[PDB]
């Protein structure tokens, strides 16, 4: 018998021929130079996730000199060759420490599971040995790396079991352990990140104990137990969500529960805050707390910190917030990428995290419903004029509030286009009186929408009108900020692409084998294959068509009417 598997050509045959052409006999290595070096350098400037051809790989193989010269030509040349036999691995690993140190941004490309090489992980760990504050923001992807950290772990597990066979029960991982033991806050972040991975991977549960053993100082462990009581607090919230009663009755019961919880908050000592690791919480105001009317039955409570100031917080249980949490972290990272351009889009980086497997917490904000703002306030103008009314003596213009509102609008549009976040509706969109445009429910993304697939821009008819009357100024300004954000993003987009590659490689909610096509789609919305920025202008033209249909065909007009009906 035989097996046909995955009237056609195949992959392994091309491997056969290509590998047959891989001789490279006379070992003398020339050091020639010519005008083609620039073109080759441009060929090495391609995106990390790309799959190079044959001739290009060989051209990069003879480029070893310049490949060592350019720091951006390192990872590309590393992926330009396949290491199986010790022959190639010899010169490879020999040139690993020989070549110039690569940029840490480009180091995230070779830090993925795509390259499992021991020397690669080693050298990368040596390059990642320096841990900045951005490593704490990279902890989200470090959890993905931790999920992908296991390859042929039977040997390591047996090695640990060898030393665990004595007393009864009662690698970059060492670098992560040292970084965890170094700063208590980073350790708390690692533990909190392990709390989520504990559900998916059973090994993470014991890895948390290994992390507790990784940190010698027990000073952080006490506050970690005080923060471990938050699990019992979430269990109490779930206990409050166990019984079914009237809306007002459940509200008063939530008040009594808030008092009983206020007793414990004063009883127990101060702990680490969910919003920031630096800030410490003191107590919570019982009468200042609120309750969500949604189906998730979220809890909103204002807790007075050690800084003697009230802090509103909204938490939820019985669901996985990892989607919107990772999306929030991505929004914060992107916000940092924008701050690196010395320009602020005035986007509010809402804090979101997952406490338990079903449980999660988020920093509350002054958010109002879009439908509520439409019905009650009768337009966004009055609502924006509610907090800080501005009537100019000339044009009746509005200040940095409206400016930040517009910047937040354009920024949210660019984010919605790029990331392709779906399930965004009038309900999923909120308005922040601080002058910010809030967006929630990131669970569906990467080209996944509840209804039929719409355009990239999330801009509705209302904002299109508000910016439509002001278009002569506001649309040109929003387009300027658009293009600027496009250049800024697409400039550094590589690192985010690699990070997203590793993160998606680990695992994802709402996406599974999406991942390949998802990476692809990210590249397409990014249009990395095009050196022309006219795509943004086309999107602007689409935004221009959002107000009025071009009516090229009857089905086109029906399509515009469909998009209008969907909103």
């Amino acid at each position: 018998r035989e097996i046909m598997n995955t009237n056609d050509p195949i992959e392994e045959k091309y491997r056969r021929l290509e590998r047959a052409s891989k001789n490279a006999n006379l070992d003398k290595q020339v050091k020639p130079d010519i005008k083609k070096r620039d073109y080759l350098n441009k060929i090495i400037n391609y995106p990390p996730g790309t799959k190079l051809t044959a001739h290009e790989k060989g051209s990069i193989w003879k480029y070893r000199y310049y490949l060592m010269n350019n720091k951006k030509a390192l990872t590309k040349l590393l992926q330009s060759t396949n290491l199986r036999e010790e022959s190639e691995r010899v010169e490879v690993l020999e040139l690993m420490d020989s070549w110039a140190e690569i940029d840490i941004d480009d180091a995230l490309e070779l830090l993925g599971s795509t390259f499992k090489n021991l020397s690669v992980r080693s050298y990368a760990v040596n390059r990642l040995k320096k841990a900045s504050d951005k490593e704490l923001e990279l902890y989200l992807l470090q959890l993905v790396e931790a999920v992908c950290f296991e390859n042929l772990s039977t040997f390591s597990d047996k090695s640990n079991s060898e030393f665990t066979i004595v007393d009864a029960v009662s690698p970059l991982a060492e670098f992560l352990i040292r970084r965890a033991l170094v700063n208590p806050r980073l350790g708390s972040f690692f533990y909190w990140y392990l709390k989520s991975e504990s559900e998916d991977k059973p090994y993470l549960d014991q890895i948390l104990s290994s992390f507790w053993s990784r940190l010698d100082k027990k000073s952080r462990n006490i506050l970690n137990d005080q923060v471990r009581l938050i699990n019992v607090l979430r269990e109490c919230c779930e206990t409050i969500k166990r019984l079914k009663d009237t809306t007002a009755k459940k509200m008063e019961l939530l008040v009594h529960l808030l008092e009983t919880k206020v007793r414990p908050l004063v009883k127990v000592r101060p702990i680490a805050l969910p919003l920031d690791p630096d800030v410490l919480i003191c107590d919570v105001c019982p009468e200042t707390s609120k309750v969500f009317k949604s189906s998730l039955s979220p809890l909103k409570i204002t807790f007075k910190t050690t800084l003697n100031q009230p802090y509103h917080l909204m938490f939820k249980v019985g669901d996985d917030l990892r989607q919107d949490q990772l999306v929030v972290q991505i929004i914060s990272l992107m916000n940092e990428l924008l701050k690196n351009e010395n320009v602020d889009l005035k986007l509010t980086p809402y804090k979101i995290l997952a406490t338990g497997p079903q449980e999660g917490a988020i920093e509350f904000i002054p958010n109002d419903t879009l439908a509520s703002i439409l019905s009650k306030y009768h337009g966004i103008l009055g609502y924006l004029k509610l907090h800080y009314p501005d009537e100019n003596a000339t044009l009746g213009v509005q200040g940095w509030v409206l400016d930040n509102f517009v910047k937040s609008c354009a920024g949210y549009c660019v984010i919605t286009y790029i990331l392709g976040v779906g399930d965004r509706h009038l309900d999923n969109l909120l308005v922040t009186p601080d002058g910010h445009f809030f967006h929630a429910d990131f669970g569906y993304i990467l080209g996944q929408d509840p209804k039929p697939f719409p355009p990239l821009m999330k801009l509705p008819p209302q904002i299109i009108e508000a910016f439509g009357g002001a278009e002569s100024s506001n649309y040109d300004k929003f387009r300027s900020y658009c293009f600027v954000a496009y250049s800024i993003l697409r400039r550094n987009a590589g690192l985010i692409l690699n990070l997203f590659e590793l993160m998606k490689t680990s695992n994802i909610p709402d996406i599974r084998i999406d991942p390949n096509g998802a990476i692809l789609r990210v590249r397409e919305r990014f249009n990395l294959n095009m050196s022309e920025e006219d795509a943004t202008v086309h999107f602007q033209n689409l935004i221009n068509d959002s107000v009025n249909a071009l009516l090229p065909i009857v089905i086109d007009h029906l399509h515009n009417l469909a998009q209008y009906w969907r909103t």
Partner: nanobody
Amino acid sequence: QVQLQESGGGLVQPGGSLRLSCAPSGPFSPNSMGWYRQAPGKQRELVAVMTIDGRTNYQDSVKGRFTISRDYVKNTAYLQMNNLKPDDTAVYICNAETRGFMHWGQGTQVTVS
């Protein structure tokens, strides 16, 4: 580029020791981070430059005096100097090049009697 906070402002006698520090806020993993000094009615020149490779370079006059080590813990740059002189009293600033885009956080006044 990124937004950084660095204050070297102060006054001291000649031969003293004044420590300078720069704490960046923004995207990390900068291509290079360095510090320089300049006076009014004059031009600014390269003083201390610390690359991302761990290598550092200093000027001719401040050689052996002004040295800059990069602390990777908080991702903060530390420039320590000694034996300041009369002509060494001026306004100092710290610049950090990131991905080809230069970033100047701030500057401060240094006075020497």
